[PDB]
Amino acid sequence: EEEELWLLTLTQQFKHIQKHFGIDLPHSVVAHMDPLLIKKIDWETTNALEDFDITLDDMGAEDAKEQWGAENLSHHFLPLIRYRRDLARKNGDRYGPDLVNG
């Protein structure tokens, strides 16, 4: 039960999205559940990069498209990263994924 809230929140949120997406899910419920993903997609639309995944499809860049998808959902791991960094800071340690050679 140390990190159960983050994993079960991920499960609950994606389960509700997958149950309702493309059928009756409102955009308000989507922007409420994942505000940072909507913020990143809105950045893409604002900066004239609305066809950016189409552009990565045109160049055949499969690894760049996989990275684009992974970076737009990179904030899902950020609660765990902040919690583990605070755990390492209370123990006096340095967080492993924060270091270059770590």
Partner 1 sequence: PSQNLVSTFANKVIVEENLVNVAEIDVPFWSYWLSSAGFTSKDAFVKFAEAVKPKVAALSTSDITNLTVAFKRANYYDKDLFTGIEANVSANFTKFETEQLLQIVATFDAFNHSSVAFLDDVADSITYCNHYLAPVRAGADELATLLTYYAKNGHERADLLATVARGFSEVSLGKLSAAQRKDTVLSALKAFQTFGFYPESIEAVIGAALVSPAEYSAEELKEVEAVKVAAENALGGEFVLIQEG
Partner 2 sequence: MSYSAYFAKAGFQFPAGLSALVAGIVALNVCTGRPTKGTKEISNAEYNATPIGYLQSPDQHPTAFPKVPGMKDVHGSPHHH
Partner 3 sequence: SSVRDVKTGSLPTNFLTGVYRFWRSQNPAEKPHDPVNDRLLPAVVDASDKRASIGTWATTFFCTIISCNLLGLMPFNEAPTSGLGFATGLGVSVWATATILGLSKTGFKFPFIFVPLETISYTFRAVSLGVRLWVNMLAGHTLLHILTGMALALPFSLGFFSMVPATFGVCCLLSALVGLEYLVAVLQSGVFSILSTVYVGEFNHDKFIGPAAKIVK
Q: Interface with partner 1 by CB under 8 A: which residues?
A: 35-36, 39-40, 43-44, 47, 49, 52, 67-68, 71-72, 74-75, 77-78, 81-82, 85, 97-102
Would you state the structure tokens that stand for residue 66, as one six-digit string? 């996989």
Task: Pick the closest to residue 49 from 40, 62, 59 (CA basis).
Answer: 40
Smallest distance, Å, CB 66 to partner 3?
Answer: 11
Count of C-beta atoms within a 10 Å radius of residue 53: 16
Q: Which of 1, 2, 4, 26 binds partner 2 (CB under 8 A)?
A: 26
What is the nearest approach in angstroms of partner 1 to the Cβ of residue 75? 5
Interface residue with partner 2, options 29, 36, 70, 80 (CB under 8 A): 29
Scan for tokens 């055949």, then name that residue: 60
3 state DSSP class of 40 = helix
